[PDB]
């Protein structure tokens, strides 16, 4: 009974490196992945291959990769900032780039937070130590 | 220096404040504010802060919902719907453990809920680890 973090990423070297990140980060969490924008908000709203809520449990967590081709962030993003029903959930984005116009837009699209993807393995089992931490320890999660 | 914008009044709270980023070695400019009005003066840069030099934009805000003349979910949801001031990151600090007090505030657009720790120590923990990820982890907006 595992916190579920769901993420959208199709890569495939890029899931396998989050799975290897979460395992070297000694975490324990279910990790979701989907890839594309429309399998991303079935799991979040429930509908079709995640009707079932049983086998697909509400996300602790979403993590979006911002460099996944049919991912529209903003339009994800601001549907679910305009839905009551789905507004508190954290989302965080994940890119390769490190522009400040960048960065400012996710925020203000309405993000939590915005990680620029490490360079490494080991770089990132820092990084997703840290965002556990704080998420998952310091802070208290939303409920759905 | 980072600028952490504060709504707080209450000079306890005040005081554990200051002496838990001193004792977390964290260098930042803590800035206190008494109420709502103050923060969002503070933010859109107004009245007592309409001088930008002497008021930085805050790199982060935190909220405290057990301060008697703030209205959070006022100023938050003032804060989202504002094109211009929607991006900043703002943190809600509380005693309050409740599970829907505490969805209630990411419904109302909190980036993130804190409780407040039991004592000095614990807070010394808990703001290194809120400081590590939104100052060194995360990369925050810029105004």
């Known amino acids: 009974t ?29 990790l979701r992945f989907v ?14 291959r995640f009707a079932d809520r049983g086998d697909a449990p509400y996300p602790a967590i979403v993590l979006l990769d911002l460099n996944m081709p049919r991912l529209d962030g903003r339009k994800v993003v601001r549907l679910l900032r305009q839905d009551e029903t789905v507004r508190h959930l954290v989302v965080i984005a994940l890119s390769t780039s490190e522009s400040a116009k960048h960065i400012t837009e996710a925020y203000s699209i309405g993000f939590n937070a915005y990680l620029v993807k490490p360079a490494n393995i080991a770089d990132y089992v820092e990084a997703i ?3 556990w931490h704080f998420w998952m320890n310091t802070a208290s999660l939303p409920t759905t």
Request: hydrophobic fraction near 35%.
């Open 35 to 48: 890839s594309d924008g429309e399998q991303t908000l079935d799991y979040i709203y429930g509908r079709n």
């Open 2 to 30: 595992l916190p579920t973090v769901l993420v959208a990423e199709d890569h495939d070297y890029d899931k396998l490196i989050l799975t290897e990140v979460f395992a070297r980060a000694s975490i324990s969490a279910d």
């Open 129 to 131: 130590r840290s965002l």
